[PDB]
Structures are given as C-alpha cells and as structure tokens.
Amino acid sequence: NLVTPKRELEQGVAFSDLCNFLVTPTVQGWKVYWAGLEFDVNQKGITLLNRLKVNDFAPAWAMTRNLFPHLFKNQQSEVQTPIWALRVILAAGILDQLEPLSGALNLIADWLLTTSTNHFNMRTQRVKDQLSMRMLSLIRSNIINFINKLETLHVVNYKGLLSSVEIGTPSYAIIITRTNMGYLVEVQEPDKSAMDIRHPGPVKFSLLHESTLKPVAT
C-alpha cells in the first residue's frame, strides 16, 4: 500500500455538487449552482424569441428571421427556458475538449442536456465510484475554459469574425451563437436536420443573456 485512502467525505461532496443541479428564484430570475459554480440567470430575451417565432409581418425582424429560419420560421422549433440554455452550455463545456472519466463525464453531460431533472441518478455503482475531487476539478476547469472561449466570440457580423461554436456528439448537435443579447443556444439532432430547407427538423433553442457567464469567465 502506497497511500492510505480516506475518501468518504470527498465522494460525498463530489456526489452532492455534481449530481444536484440547484435552482432557486431570486428577484431578477434564478440563481443556479452546480459543480460549485454559481450563475445568475434572468428572463431577458425569452419574450423576444417567442415574438420572433410568430409568422406575422414585421420588416424590422425580417433579417433575423431569415438568418435563422430553422428557429424562427419552423413549426418544429421550440423555445426553452434560459435555465435550459445554461444547462446546454454546461454540457457543451464538458463535451468540448472531451480517459476513464469519459464515460462518466458523458453521462453527466447527457443528464444536463437531455433532461430537466434536478438530481442525477447514477446509472451504475461503478460510475458512482468515479465521483471524486479530481472529476469535479476537471469538470470545473473544462467549463471555465469553454466559458472563456464563448466570451471570445464576436456578435453576428459582416466581417467574417467568428460568432459561433458547434459541439457534435452521436446523440445531438449543439450550436451556440453570439448575438447582441447574449448566447443563442440550440440543440438539433446529430445530422442537423433542422438545417434541411424542404423539411426542417425539430430543434430546441433559447437565449442566455450575456450577464450570466461574464462573472464566471477568467
């Protein structure tokens, strides 16, 4: 034996911080706390995305509607909560640079991204055995790095400066675009079937106001 393990506390804390997605209401909107990271989410942008979807006549929004027709002119797109937008971004932060942790990490990301449950029921006892300060630290570091990358994006522009990132996996495609309001977040099927003009596939999307990630960037 090289080092005596004393891991109960460690595993208890990692389990708590990784497997509980904490949301509480605040005056502005909601505070979210996950993996020891704190985010203030507000309502800004939601009503705009909703109005934007309606097939009414509005020349002022013609360009935006025509820029993202798969979001704004599509009966199968659905606006989600800003909480959802944050969950997608956290998952993307895990997947972005994604050896034994991989499995577990993926699980956590899939939980964040494909469900709205606040507790993550571990699939197997072995994956649960994976929970550690090291896994938590890796996850936080990944998320911070991805937030920093996001903060380098330019708003949609006419000059060819990067304005979006895309994360692909076999189960889904994530696209995150910097707009004047914040991060436009979308999840489409892996083949990106929402992008097909003749029959636009289903797509979930929302907006995370730019106030939310700023303070967590380093």
Residue numbers in the entry: 9 to 106, 113 to 232
Reproduce text from the manuscript describing this model.
VP24, one of only eight proteins encoded by ebolaviruses, functions in virus replication and assembly, and is thought to contribute to immune suppression by binding to a certain class of molecules called karyopherins to prevent them from transporting a transcription factor termed STAT1. In addition to its role in interferon antagonism, ebolavirus VP24 has also been proposed to associate with membranes, and is important for assembly and function of the viral ribonucleoprotein complex (RNP), where VP24 binds to the viral nucleoprotein NP. VP24 adopts a compact, single domain, α/β structure of novel fold (DaliLite v.3).
In order to provide 3D templates for understanding VP24 and its many roles in immune evasion, replication and assembly, we crystallized VP24 from Sudan virus (two versions crystallized: SUDV1–233 and SUDV11–233) and Reston virus (one version crystallized: RESTV11–237). We subsequently determined structures of SUDV1–233 and RESTV11–237 by molecular replacement, both at 2.0 Å resolution. One pairwise VP24-VP24 interaction is conserved in the crystal packing between the SUDV (P3121) and RESTV VP24 (P1211) structures, although it is currently unclear if it is biologically relevant. This interaction involves α1, β1–3 and the N-terminal region of α8, and buries residue L147 that was previously implicated for virulence, although 142–146 remain solvent exposed. Another crystal lattice interaction observed in both RESTV and SUDV structures involves packing of the hydrophobic N-terminal regions of VP24 into the Face 3 pocket of a neighboring molecule.
